[PDB]
């Protein structure tokens, strides 16, 4: 199945979807009539092939001269998030689901673009320094201007946790120069190991009913959860608890036996981790209605994640903020103020109980589940929409 969760990052109206299309052919759709013209809310999904010519996009070597057929390397799946500074929660969720990143910078649009920088920062925070950098709108720029842009980018990427991350000049519309990108996908991104015995944990980003308009109820379908595994091969025929729960104010975890564990385009026996998977469960498709299973944790039955509202956070912050042009000073965190705490996939609205030296105690208005220590990206409301302040770990 899908071997490595590779994410796509860039500015809004630059062409992440376009890039995906160029790579795979699989469309992110762009939907709900708002997003048909403009920008997606959900993650965009695509399945790209790597079968190398060693003597590729398709498993045949008729194209690159030598008739010695395309030698199977990998199959990779995309994690394409919204690159808008309003919808950052989704991006954050994607980030602690990904194994590696793909940057997208346009030629004619500037080098210190705010959103892109923010994305980069997020990636750095959430252990995602494996970034393949792509020059995108180069089918517009001069023989000198492009070079200048590249130089500027290089200059920028000197103090960042990205040091010598590779840059490729592609056209997402004209279909050129993606060979290099493909090569890098095997070269610069090795897949981090993901075993059998590391306790099975599924991180849900999407809720899906496949209940088509027109059918009869004597021919029914269950609930499908679109979520990623980063530990534990889920096999067909297992019982599950989804632990952030269902709301009564108290919450109670949801129990579902596996109908299917579906990856690629064809349903499989297994779901080997480091991939984003559509899990058919006996759970109602009415709870998989639109975007209900977003930021929920799934464990195999006989397991104890903990649903915390009162949290011990170890926090770290910036000197100067991101999301804006206008990079504003980080004023100190203020008590009993609504922050957004992004933990793996959750985007919970939290109130500050205490501020110490490097630790903070937080109240959650919506309960999140901590199994391990859990990776956090933090966010705040200063300029209406949510800006990225810093990062944390749950000290548990």
């Amino acid at each position: 199945q899908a071997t490595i969760n590779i994410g796509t990052i860039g500015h809004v109206a630059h062409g992440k979807s376009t890039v995906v299309r160029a790579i795979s052919g699989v469309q992110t759709v762009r939907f709900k009539d708002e997003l048909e013209r403009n920008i997606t809310i959900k993650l965009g999904y695509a399945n790209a092939k790597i079968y190398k010519c060693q003597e590729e996009i398709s498993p045949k070597c008729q194209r690159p001269g030598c008739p010695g057929r395309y030698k199977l390397v990998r199959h990779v799946s995309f994690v394409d998030c919204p690159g808008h500074d309003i919808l950052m929660s989704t991006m954050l969720s994607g980030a602690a689901v990904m194994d590696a990143a793909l940057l997208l910078i346009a030629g004619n649009e500037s080098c210190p673009q705010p959103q892109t920088s923010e994305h980069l920062a997020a990636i750095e925070i959430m252990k995602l320094k494996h970034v393949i950098i792509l020059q995108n709108k180069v089918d517009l720029m001069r023989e000198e201007s492009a070079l200048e842009h590249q130089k500027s980018i290089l200059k920028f990427i000197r103090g960042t946790i990205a040091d010598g991350a590779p840059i490729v000049p592609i056209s997402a519309q004209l279909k050129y120069n993606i060979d290099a990108v493909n090569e890098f996908i095997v070269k610069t991104i090795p897949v981090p190991p993901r075993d059998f015995m590391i306790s099975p944990r599924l991180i849900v980003i999407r809720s899906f009913d496949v209940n088509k308009p027109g059918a009869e109820i004597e021919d029914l379908k269950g609930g499908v959860a679109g979520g990623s595994i980063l530990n534990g091969v889920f096999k067909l025929g297992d019982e599950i608890e989804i632990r952030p729960g269902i709301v009564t104010i108290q919450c109670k975890p949801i129990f579902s036996n596996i109908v299917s564990l579906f990856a690629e385009q064809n349903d499989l026996k297994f779901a080997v981790p480091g991939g984003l998977i559509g899990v058919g469960t006996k759970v109602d498709p009415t709870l998989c209605r639109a975007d209900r299973l977003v930021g929920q944790v799934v464990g195999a039955k006989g397991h104890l994640p903990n649903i915390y509202t009162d949290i011990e956070i170890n926090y770290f912050l910036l000197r100067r903020l991101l999301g804006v042009k206008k990079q504003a000073k980080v004023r100190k965190l203020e008590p009993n103020e609504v922050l957004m705490v992004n933990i793996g996939s959750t985007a919970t609205g939290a109130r500050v109980v205490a501020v110490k030296a490097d630790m903070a105690r937080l109240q959650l208005t919506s309960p999140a589940c901590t199994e391990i220590n859990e990776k956090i990206a933090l966010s705040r409301r200063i300029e209406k929409h949510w800006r990225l302040i810093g990062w944390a770990t749950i000290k548990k």
Partner: protein
């Protein structure tokens, strides 16, 4: 072409009970046209209409409206024929009214047939009207039995078989419910299936996982009052035993 006879005699032979409407009344009584032989007309006397002397203010409210009338006398070679409705019993009113409603609902099923297949109306009318109205009573309960017993169609021939098909075509309601299955469970699918397996066996359609459009058929329009309610009750029953939540509009 337009309209024609009942039963192949030129006039309503003496002392039968027909229906008319009064056209105008000046001094003779009314110039009643016969509603069974439509284009023909007769008349009727002033003292014959009730016993009371009819006021002009009473005369105006009655014209155009139709009623029942027995026939006193008939010239066999003149259309100048009398009618009568003082000597009409109360039962005969309802009997001839039922016979004339029968007549109109067996005329309306052949009017458009003759005037849209474009043939002379009288010939196929009479080739139906000899055996079915001479054997027993005419075409209403003849044709209500003709669609289940097809020996009527082969007993006499029509000049064309397209009017046959249209007569077979003429004589031979949804209560909408947007029930909202707002479930948050694990055994909900089964419940839904169970619900389907009793409420559909009337027209049930899936819209999504929550919304369902079911258009329950009613016979008296008020007989689907006992159906929709029943369905609702079933729905209520269903979801308490499985784990989810169903809400009804």
């Amino acid at each position: 072409t337009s309209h024609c006879r009942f039963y192949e005699n030129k006039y309503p032979e003496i002392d039968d009970i027909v229906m008319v409407n009064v056209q105008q009344i000046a001094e003779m009584g009314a110039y009643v046209k016969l509603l069974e032989y439509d284009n023909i007309e007769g008349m009727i006397l002033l003292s014959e209409l009730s016993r009371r002397r009819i006021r002009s203010i009473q005369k105006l409210i009655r014209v155009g409206k139709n009623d029942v009338a027995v026939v006193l006398r008939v010239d066999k070679e003149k259309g100048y024929i009398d009618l009568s409705k003082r000597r009409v019993s109360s039962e005969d009113i309802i009997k001839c009214e039922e016979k004339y409603q029968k007549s109109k609902t067996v005329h309306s099923i052949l009017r458009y047939c003759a005037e849209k297949f474009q043939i002379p109306l009288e010939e196929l009318y009479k080739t139906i009207a000899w055996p079915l109205s001479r054997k027993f009573g005419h075409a209403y309960e003849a044709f209500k039995l003709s669609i289940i017993d097809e020996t009527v169609w082969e007993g006499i021939e029509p000049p064309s078989k397209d009017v046959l098909d249209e007569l077979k075509n003429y004589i031979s309601v949804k209560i909408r419910a947007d029930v909202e299955v707002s479930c948050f469970s694990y055994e909900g699918i089964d419940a839904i299936k169970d619900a389907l397996k009793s409420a559909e066996d009337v027209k049930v359609k899936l819209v999504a996982a929550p919304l369902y459009v079911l258009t329950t058929q009613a016979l008296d329009k008020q007989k689907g009052i006992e159906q929709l309610e029943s369905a609702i009750e079933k729905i209520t029953e269903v979801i308490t035993k499985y784990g989810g939540v169903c809400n009804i509009t």
